[PDB]
Every structure is written in structure tokens, then in C-alpha cells.
């Protein structure tokens, strides 16, 4: 991967309005529907269930698990079958010692079962920009959410982000450096969430001790439904174990930084979830194919004020199989059972907190963890990026004039080239020394076969067809051509067709800028230059397109006209 460091460039970006998070968001949501559409649909499973609590000694054990027998269809239409299964408490509701139970989504939305073969494991994916566009990467260790980044570089595609859906704790994220970051759109406004990034990872161990089994009961021709079978072994709760020394130590890093915004000596308490659906209230995360829901009350009961066993923390976690990711209406997914005992071990790299508010000020401050939206899981990683389009047609005045109408070498070792867009922070004279660097990259791959060279392998997009990224690539390769040919068409009317630098006869008006040639070319970057001339750049493009190069054509041939 080629990453270029820009010298003397102070480009700032706003994390909250960053357009890269919403594109991924709509990208994952579109990706999910493209995977569940080909899978089998459990429309016949919405049938009155007759459930009997699973074999357990009631000491209170208040098992959520049920054992329900239902009249299910089979391969033949006239025939039926009475089969049983197991369902947690969260998946079934009572319909007014076995009683009648109903699947939770039957009254609201249809349900469809995720294919057993597809894996929900997050893999790193990098997002790049199309040919003719650039991505600016902040390299400031102490970088705030919004503001100038003193050290900026550029890269084609971002380092891959593992898309991990996490409600209360960010999982397997990028570690911060030195002090932990407290990024917020407005720390004073409670409505905006408080995103945190850890510098030291907190390991977490989650398990489902119940040794379930998978039972495939054919329910349609070519269609098979997967239900939980007999549970082997002790009935136990799903739990997550986090070491208290490390969590107490990290929690001490977050509380120290928070005092900078609210004062040195103030009450900083941590509290529990204050309400919401089962998603927001618990640490909803996926592991091994199932979806845990952990009460985090043991992590977030503490009180800090001013200054001054070695056993782990255990979390009771519920498990649900019927879920509507991202609060979508009219849709539901049934995750198939996972045979055997499963273990989870991940790293905690960030939290999503909330301001409590209230009328009292400077008396007490409590932070309540929450997971209102999944977009905040993407802002925790796309914070250091920004998308920009490069514009290569910059005009400037110079005493050089057009070759008279009546009229008709160093070979290498140019020094200290800066790479693509490396001269963006250098002077206009120094930046004008490297023009083929950008002109190479305006079209096709910026580096190492970046895009067009890649789309050459066969059956990559043919098999892909229009699914997912297949339409993303056509819009990225067609827009690249349309922007390149736009500048060439601008030259075709302006003269200078094969020339990177052309001077044509057009007078530079003094009202556009009162600065002299020296001061402009001595110590100015082309970026600052495009700002002042931005008000007049359209007019220059109108005088230069015809009066400069079409008056010549009308005169140039008249000159040779009979």
C-alpha cells in the first residue's frame, strides 16, 4: 500500500459530518439483505406452539429455555408431522402442563432463516476512492474529533476496518496511542454520544456453556429448517468474564481524561443503563453464530472524586435467535443453532457513553453507557479519514505570452520528488515542478494496480453481476473517465491539448488579485491560490475558452483563406 506524507499541510475534517460512515452503514445493511434473500424462509413456522419447560431443577433456575412441539409441514403437501424444538424465552410470547406459545415476530413481521453456510465473522475491508479522488488520513496521535490535523498524509484505501456490531462496548477496534481519546461532537450537549478509544486492550471471555445440538427437520422440498435438539450436560447461563484489575485500571484512565472538560475536583460516577430495548440496554454482540445480550451493571457501578482477590467480573448474558438488526420494520432473522459449546475472546477498545444532564451543575456527573445507533461503531474507526476530489486545472498569471501568430535540456535525475500530492504544502513554484505526478494518477490506478488494473481478472464481476460492489465499480470507473475527459475537453477548447503548461494570450485583470508575481510564487501553496481565485475562476474559464482559442481559429484560417 502506498501512503504519502504531505509536508506543511493543515487540512482539517469534521468527524460527525463525515460522509464515509453513512456510506458504509447503508453498505452493511444492503449487504445483509443480499445474503438473506437466497436463504430459506420460515413462513410455515408461525404456528401455535405447545411448550413445556426444559428439564431443570427450580431453585431460582428460571430457565428461559422452552421445549415446544408443533405440527410442521413436510416434503409432501397432504402429509404433516409433529416435531419438537427448543426456544429461548425471548423468542416466544404467550397466546391466550403445556400452554400455547407464539413466535414473537408473527404478529409484526415475516421471518427468514440465515443460511447455515454463511459466516457472520467480521473481516477487514478497506474502502478506497475512485480514480480522480483522494483520501486524507490524519496521523495526529492526540487528534480531537473536529479540528485541524497538523500532520496529514494521503492514501488510496483506508486500513481495513473489521465491521463489528457492538452495542455498548466497541470490539476488536483500533487502539489509541498514549492517553485515551474522548471524541464528542459537543461534550456540553448530552444528546450527542460520547465515543471513547482505548490505548490498552481489555480482553473479554464469553461462552455459552450449554452444549446444544442441531436438528435438521425437512419442512419443504429442498428446504430444511434447523431446530435445537436435546441439550447435553448441565443447564448453565451464558456469561462473560472480564478481569477486574484491568477493567479497574482502564476505567481509571477514562475518568482521568474526563476531568479536563468538567473540572479537576468534581464527582464522576458511573451508572447502569437507564432504559431502552434489549439492544441498547445490554452489550449485544455476536459470537460463534449466536447473539449474546449481557447486562453490564457490574462493569459500570463506581464513583470517582478527586484522587485517592484478583478475580474476574462475570456478566449474565441472555441469548436470542429471532432478531431485527438495525431496528428495521417488516424484517426478521432466525439464526440457526450452533452445535457444541462455544467460546468468545475479544478486545474491548472503546465505549459509547452518555451525559446524564439535570438541573444541578458542578455537583455530580454520571455517565450511562448506551448503544443508540450502529453508525457510532463506524465513526470510531473512520474518524481519521476524509474524501476529497482533486482538481488539476489551476490558472495563474505570468509574464509569459502566446507565441506570435505570425511566427512559425535536462534528461533526468530530478531531485527529492514527494510522491502523489506531496507538493500540496510546498510553494506554487516548487509545486509546479511536479505535474506528471498527478497526471499519472488522475486516471487508472493511483498505485500498485489500484483499480482499473484490478478489474481485469475474469468471473470476479461476472459472477458478482450487479450484486453488491459490482454496481459500485461501474459507477466508480465511469465517473473516473467522465472527470478525466472533462479536463481534456476543457483543454480542447482552451488550446494546450498536449501541454501540461501552456501560456495563451489572455490579459490578467488586476482586480482578480493585487499581489505581485514574486509574492504569489515565492510563498504560496496552490491550495491557498485556488481560494482567492475561486470567485473569478468561472469567468477566466469563459474568456479563455473562445476569445483565447476560438478567435485564433477564426483568424488563423482567415489568414490562409483564399
Amino acid at each position, epitope marked *: 500500500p502506498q501512503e504519502i506524507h504531505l509536508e506543511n499541510v493543515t487540512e482539517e475534517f469534521n468527524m460527525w459530518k463525515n460522509n464515509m460512515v453513512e456510506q458504509m452503514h447503508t453498505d452493511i445493511i444492503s449487504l445483509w439483505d443480499q445474503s438473506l434473500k437466497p436463504c430459506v424462509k420460515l413462513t410455515p413456522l408461525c404456528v401455535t406452539l405447545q411448550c413445556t419447560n426444559v428439564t431443570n431443577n427450580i431453585t431460582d433456575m428460571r430457565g428461559e429455555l422452552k421445549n415446544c412441539s408443533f405440527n410442521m409441514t413436510t416434503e409432501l403437501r397432504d402429509k404433516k408431522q409433529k416435531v419438537y424444538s427448543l426456544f429461548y424465552r425471548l423468542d416466544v410470547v404467550q397466546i391466550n402442563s403445556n400452554k400455547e406459545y407464539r413466535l414473537i415476530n408473527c404478529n409484526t413481521s415475516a421471518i427468514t432463516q440465515a443460511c447455515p453456510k454463511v459466516s457472520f465473522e467480521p473481516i477487514p475491508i478497506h474502502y478506497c476512492a475512485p480514480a480522480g479522488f483522494a483520501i486524507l488520513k490524519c496521523k495526529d496521535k492526540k487528534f480531537n474529533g473536529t479540528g485541524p490535523c497538523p500532520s496529514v498524509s494521503t492514501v488510496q484505501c483506508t486500513h481495513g476496518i473489521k465491521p463489528v456490531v457492538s452495542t455498548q462496548l466497541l470490539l476488536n477496534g483500533s487502539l489509541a496511542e498514549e492517553e485515551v481519546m474522548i471524541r464528542s461532537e459537543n461534550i456540553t450537549n448530552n444528546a450527542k454520544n460520547i465515543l471513547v478509544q482505548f490505548n490498552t486492550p481489555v480482553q473479554i471471555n464469553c461462552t455459552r456453556p450449554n452444549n446444544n445440538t442441531r436438528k435438521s427437520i425437512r419442512i419443504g422440498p429442498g428446504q430444511a429448517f434447523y431446530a435445537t435438539g436435546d441439550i447435553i450436560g448441565d443447564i448453565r447461563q451464558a456469561h462473560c468474564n472480564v478481569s477486574k484489575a484491568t477493567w479497574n485500571e482502564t476505567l481509571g484512565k477514562v475518568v482521568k481524561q474526563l476531568r479536563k472538560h468538567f473540572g479537576n475536583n468534581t464527582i464522576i460516577r458511573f451508572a447502569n443503563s437507564s*432504559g431502552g430495548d434489549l439492544e441498547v440496554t445490554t452489550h449485544s454482540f455476536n459470537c460463534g453464530g449466536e447473539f449474546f445480550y449481557c447486562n453490564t451493571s457490574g462493569l459500570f457501578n463506581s464513583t470517582w472524586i478527586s484522587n485517592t482477590s484478583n478475580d474476574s467480573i462475570t456478566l449474565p448474558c441472555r441469548i436470542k435467535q429471532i432478531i431485527n438488526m438495525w431496528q428495521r*420494520i417488516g424484517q426478521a432473522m432466525y439464526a440457526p443453532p450452533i452445535q457444541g459449546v462455544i467460546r468468545c475472546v475479544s478486545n474491548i477498545t472503546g465505549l459509547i457513553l452518555t451525559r446524564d444532564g439535570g438541573s444541578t451543575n458542578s455537583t455530580t456527573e454520571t455517565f450511562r453507557p448506551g448503544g443508540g445507533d450502529m453508525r457510532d461503531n463506524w465513526r470510531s474507526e473512520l474518524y481519521k479519514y476524509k474524501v476529497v476530489k482533486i482538481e488539476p486545472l489551476g490558472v495563474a498569471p505570468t509574464r509569459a505570452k502566446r507565441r506570435v501568430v505570425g511566427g512559425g535540456s535536462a534528461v533526468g535525475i530530478g531531485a527529492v520528488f514527494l510522491g502523489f500530492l506531496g507538493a500540496a504544502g510546498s510553494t506554487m513554484g516548487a509545486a509546479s515542478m511536479t505535474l506528471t505526478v498527478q497526471a499519472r494518477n488522475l486516471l487508472s490506478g493511483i498505485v500498485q494496480q489500484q483499480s482499473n488494473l484490478l478489474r481485469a481478472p475474469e468471473a470476479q464481476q461476472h459472477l458478482l453481476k450487479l450484486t453488491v460492489w459490482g454496481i459500485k465499480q461501474l459507477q466508480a470507473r465511469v465517473l473516473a473517465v467522465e472527470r478525466y475527459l472533462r479536463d481534456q475537453q476543457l483543454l480542447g477548447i482552451w488550446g494546450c491539448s498536449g501541454k501540461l503548461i501552456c501560456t495563451t494570450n489572455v490579459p490578467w485583470n488586476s482586480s482578480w488579485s493585487n499581489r505581485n508575481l514574486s509574492e504569489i510564487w515565492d510563498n504560496m501553496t496552490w491550495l491557498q491560490w485556488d481560494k482567492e481565485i475561486s470567485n473569478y475562476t468561472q469567468i477566466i474559464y469563459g474568456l479563455l475558452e473562445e476569445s483565447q482559442n476560438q478567435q485564433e481559429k477564426n483568424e488563423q484560417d482567415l489568414l490562409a483563406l483564399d
Partner: antibody
Amino acid sequence: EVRLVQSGAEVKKPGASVRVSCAASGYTFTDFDIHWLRQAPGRGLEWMGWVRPLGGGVSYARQFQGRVTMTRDFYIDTAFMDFRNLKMDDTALYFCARMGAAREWDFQYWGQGTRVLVSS
Amino acid sequence: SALTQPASVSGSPGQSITISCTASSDFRGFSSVSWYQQVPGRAPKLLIFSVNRRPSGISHRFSGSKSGNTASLTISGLQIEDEADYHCNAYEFFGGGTKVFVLG
């Protein structure tokens, strides 16, 4: 054509734990957070809590912790507010409002209000 | 009331009168204010959401600016329709209301 519709006036003895409904119409309900504000006759407006439709997240004021609880339902585009253990001091008009499109702490749309009086 | 508002204001029709919004010495990040025109006993009406920006349905006569820790609202060409209860809010904090009186 966006307007919030509240519940009707109700009277209750202390400890009665009244709930109020706020109906949303004319816009995508699942986008903006809903706020509950109460105004006494001899006092200014007071902010009680905000709850957003996606995920039900809710933040409650310090003095209303353990006393109030807010939820919502996407199918009926309505946010509810459960105010348990009501007191004689808490009698006033209850408004539910939505923040403006500018996303700053401003309220562009309101409701007709509900009258809640506690007495013996 | 984390902030405070003037108890009563009085002025002749057509005269410009200003309203203030106090700030505590411990206020943090006081960067936005929205004013409201609440009919006594009815739903409030948003006069300006941001410090200076105004909605469409609100007249041009209503204006507002912030200097230091004080927010100011000025009315020009006062009419009786304008008489109501006014409130300035910063984040969740509100004010006790500003009584208005039209003379005579």
C-alpha cells in the same frame, strides 16, 4: 404538515403514576428524538427527558430518576412517558416537542399539551 | 433555573426593547441559544432556533445576538400580537419567563 398530538387532561391523587402519549405525523418518526417539557403557571419551562425512536434510548433528569420512565412504539409513531409517584408540587402542563432540523437545542414543533392536576 | 431572565419589560408600540439571558459563572460551552414566544397557557412558538438564524414563518422584526455570556433579543415595530411569554434556553436549561407589557 408536521404536528404532535398529546393525550387529554387527567386528574389523579398522589401516587397514581400517569402516562402520556405523544403522536407524531408528517415526517419520519424514527429520526428525531422526542422531548417532554413541563411548565407550571408561576414557573418557566422545565426539561424532563428525551427518548429516541430507534432503540428507545432515553436520558432522564437527575430529580426525575426513579420517578419517570419513557418509551415509544414505532408502529403507532408514538412516544410515551410514565411518571410514577406523582406529587403535589408536580402539577403543571406537560408538553412534548421535537427538535428542529438544525439539530441544535431548539424546538420547532410542539403539541397542544395535556393538563395534569394532582389534588385530594 | 440554571440561568435567569428579566422579570418584566415595558415599552411603547414601535419602540425597540431588549431582553437578556443570564449565564452562571460555572456555565460550560455556552455557544447556542433559541428563543420562544409562548402564548400564556398555550404551545410555545420558536422565534429563532440558532443565535441569529430565523425560521420561515417568523417575522423579520425578531432578531438576536450574543455578546460574551449574555444573549440579547431585540424587537422592532412592536404590535400587540407579539405580546406573550418569552423564554431563552441553553441546552436543557430554561428560564423563568419574561413578562411583557405594552403601553398604553
